[PDB]
């Protein structure tokens, strides 16, 4: 499911990822200890996105890159991971452009074919009530059990 007449460029900019829910354990684990992480998104060479996230570690902003490849649809990406052999499909189900945006990846290619993560992206730092009862709804709608449903704090 795609977030309906998708406009990419009203996507561009600054979020925070605010929560995210996965089947991967320690992938929930570490996301936990890093907390809330600045993201922004800008168009890519293809058509599609780049997704600059950056985290604190030590005394240092750690900067990573992830190429979103347009896959066929507006609003659906694929992302290929060298270091996990794999490819993932990343959709922006549901989004207002101002507010929020709920994402759904699941592995399609490779060993990591099993993964499912949602994650919830807010344009602000503190996400509020309804927001954080909005994306448990949605973890819960794509089989997430509560205890695999973390928030991630700023």
């Given at each position: 499911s795609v977030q309906p007449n998708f406009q990419q460029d009203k996507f561009l900019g600054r979020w925070f990822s605010?929560?995210?829910?996965?089947?991967?354990?320690?992938?929930?684990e570490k996301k936990a200890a890093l907390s809330m992480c600045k993201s922004v998104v800008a168009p890519a060479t293809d058509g599609g996105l780049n997704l600059t996230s950056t985290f604190l570690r030590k005394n240092q902003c750690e900067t990573r890159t992830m190429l979103l490849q347009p896959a066929g649809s507006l609003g659906s990406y694929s992302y290929r991971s060298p270091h996990w052999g794999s490819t993932y499909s990343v959709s922006v189900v549901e989004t207002d452009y101002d507010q929020y945006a709920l994402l759904y990846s699941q592995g399609s290619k490779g060993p990591g074919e099993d993964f499912r993560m949602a994650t919830l992206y807010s344009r602000t730092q503190?996400?509020?009530?309804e927001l954080k009862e909005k994306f448990t709804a949605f973890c819960k709608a794509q089989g997430f059990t509560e205890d695999t449903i973390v928030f991630l704090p700023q």
């Open positions: 605010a929560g995210l829910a996965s089947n991967s354990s320690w992938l929930r503190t996400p509020r009530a």
